[PDB]
Amino acid sequence: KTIVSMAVIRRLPRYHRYLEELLKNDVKRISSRELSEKMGVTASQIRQDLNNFGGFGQQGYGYNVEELYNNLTKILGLDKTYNTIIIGAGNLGQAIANYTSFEKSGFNLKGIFDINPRLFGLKIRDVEVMDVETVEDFIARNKIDIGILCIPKDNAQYTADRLVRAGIKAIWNFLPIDLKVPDDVILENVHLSDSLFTVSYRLNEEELFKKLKGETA
Template sequence: MAVIKRLPKYHQCLGKLLRQDVERISSQELSQLLGFTASQIRQDLNNFGEFGQQGYGYNVESLYNEIAKILGLNTVHNMIIVGAGNLGQALANYEDFETHGFKILALFDVNPRLIGLKIRGIPILDADEMDYFINRNDIDIAVIAVPSDRAPKVVEILTKTSVKGIWNFSTAEISTGKNIIVENVHLIDSLFTLSYRMNEEKLEERILKQKMKKVLNR
């Protein structure tokens, strides 16, 4: 479902409106703010319920809350970050996560120089204690920020815990027999996409030639 990718945008936009004390909004107005068509917005929202009111539009606060509920943001998520290198530390410093109910309780690493340190008050613990810590602290999301070759080992440990979601920053393909949800962040793919788009102009000729050939074939 392509809707899911848009839900965070709705959420963010409504949050902004809420902070500006906007009370109600129409799909038309939202359309202008978000760049989706009004029709699509009504269609999207209607997948999950009837949140609007004819002749009035949508109540910003209640729509915001409904979408938060859909995104699972109405409960606090306890997270750990596996790997306390630069990436792990960078993520631990993102205050944005906590703002939205994703609480980082600890980082884990194998490097004795890092163990014992704190990032924004969040302790870096010994990787050996990970499974114990997870089950003890009701952790439901683990962030994988270790080098890709270490990732499979980490995943193996995680599958034996209560973790329900893995946010994977390594390039390793992760598969857990269990029903753990895995969300991949492949940064290099994003960079390649940027590169492709920068290169697109030069490519035009080639693509056009290919299309023309097909048209001429008819």
């Protein structure tokens, strides 16, 4: 359980995103008026959400883009730095390993790990792939903050444990399993496996209620 309501927290990187578009375009200031306009949210929510972390607004003025942006940056914690590792140098593994946008925002890939020894030594974007046996130790030596999980779901909770045990601070989970972690570990589930299904679901939904509303009268 976190201090701010999660519904809100999930909307923060979104503000961060739009605010930076405005900053990038030399727009000097914006009002929640115009922002909710632009983001298709309610002007209340915006003022509402923001006023969990204080007033960045100025009556009569609106919000100074540069100053609010720079503040969301600090709120999302992106003024700091995060050492990350990837477990599972697979397809997804490597695609995530190659992607560098994350770096810009503070997240530095320190290591990649796999069981399959063919891969040991292999270098992706200049981080070498290492035996996942040594992970528990490497985490401890290198103050690893986030572990990115891209190994097959099978018996993976075991590996998740070894991570937690070794003092990993949060896990980013790409497997289609709900993992079990301690209270002091942030688990972020992705679950494409699911997200996709809400699409197949939405596509069929409208016809699925002729299938069920043709069941009473």
